Amino acid sequence: IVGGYTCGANTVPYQVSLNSGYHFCGGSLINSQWVVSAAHCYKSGIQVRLGEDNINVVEGNEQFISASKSIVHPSYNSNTLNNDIMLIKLKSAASLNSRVASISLPTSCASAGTQCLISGWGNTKSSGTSYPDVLKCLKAPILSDSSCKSAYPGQITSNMFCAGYLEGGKDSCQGDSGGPVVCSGKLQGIVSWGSGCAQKNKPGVYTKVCNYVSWIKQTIASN
Numbered sequence: 001i002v003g004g005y006t007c008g009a010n011t012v013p014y015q016v017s018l019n020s021g022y023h024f025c026g027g028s029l030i031n032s033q034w035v036v037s038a039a040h041c042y043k044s045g046i047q048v049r050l051g052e053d054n055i056n057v058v059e060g061n062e063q064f065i066s067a068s069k070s071i072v073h074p075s076y077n078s079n080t081l082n083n084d085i086m087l088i089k090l091k092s093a094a095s096l097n098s099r100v101a102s103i104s105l106p107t108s109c110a111s112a113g114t115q116c117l118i119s120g121w122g123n124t125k126s127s128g129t130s131y132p133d134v135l136k137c138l139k140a141p142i143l144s145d146s147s148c149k150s151a152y153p154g155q156i157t158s159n160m161f162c163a164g165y166l167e168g169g170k171d172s173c174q175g176d177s178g179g180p181v182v183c184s185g186k187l188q189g190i191v192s193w194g195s196g197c198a199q200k201n202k203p204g205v206y207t208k209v210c211n212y213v214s215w216i217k218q219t220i221a222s223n
């Protein structure tokens with residue numbers, strides 16, 4: 001997260017870190033045994049880390065659970081990143097409390113102008129790599145489809161939306177991929193891509209979760 005602030009330990013209880021010997025992506029806890037992340041974050045050997053704040057120190061509240069299976073959307077296209085969503089089933093259920101909690105899926109899509117909270121342990125520099133130890137947060141608004149499409153002509157599908165600042169300076173970045181975009185207490189997006197980080201006129205692009213709610217529900221119901 002570039003231009004964000006320190007969230008404060010366990011203030012974002014549905015945030016998870018996908019770890020394979022190091023933190024590589026974020027994710028959101030939606031129930032005690034399932035997490036949603038981005039399909040481009042897929043790999044084998046994923047350990048899900050819940051209740052984290054400082055990813056390099058065990059401080060208490062953490063729960064490390066291995067993933068039993070990862071389900072990448074069947075229509076995920078790695079070249080366009082259309083349908084960039086994945087579900088991870090945990091080997092065992094997490095113990096939910098006030099530090100580890102699930103986030104609700106939306107009943108409707110959000111509108112431009114809606115203010116959302118994006119969080120993660122991704123890069124904090126737009127020019128260079130500086131990864132933090134603690135969770136960073138950023139408040140950003142969903143942009144209108146015309147500003148999104150004018151920024152990335154030909155690259156936005158109806159399963160994506162832009163959120164951020166056209167002036168640059170604040171944005172999600174590499175390492176934040178897979179994490180949550182929560183607006184009005186509902187999970188509306190998944191950090192997916194962008195051109196660089198916090199560059200002028202190149203806002204972040206997110207997977208539009210409202211379009212996948214029936215899919216998520218059906219898939220969880222059958223696995």
Ligand SMILES: NC(=[NH2+])c1ccc2[nH]c(-c3cccc(-c4ccccc4)c3[O-])nc2c1
Pocket residue numbers: 024025040041171172173174175176177191192193194195196197198203204205
């Ligand atoms: N400007 C942005 N809002 C933004 C957001 C997420 C990003 N994620 C990335 C990204 C860049 C390089 C590699 C990965 C990557 C690839 C495979 C696995 C994990 C991360 C990224 O997610 N750039 C990103 C840029």
Ligand SMILES: [Ca+2]
Pocket residue numbers: 052053054055056057058059060062
């Ligand atoms: Ca820790």
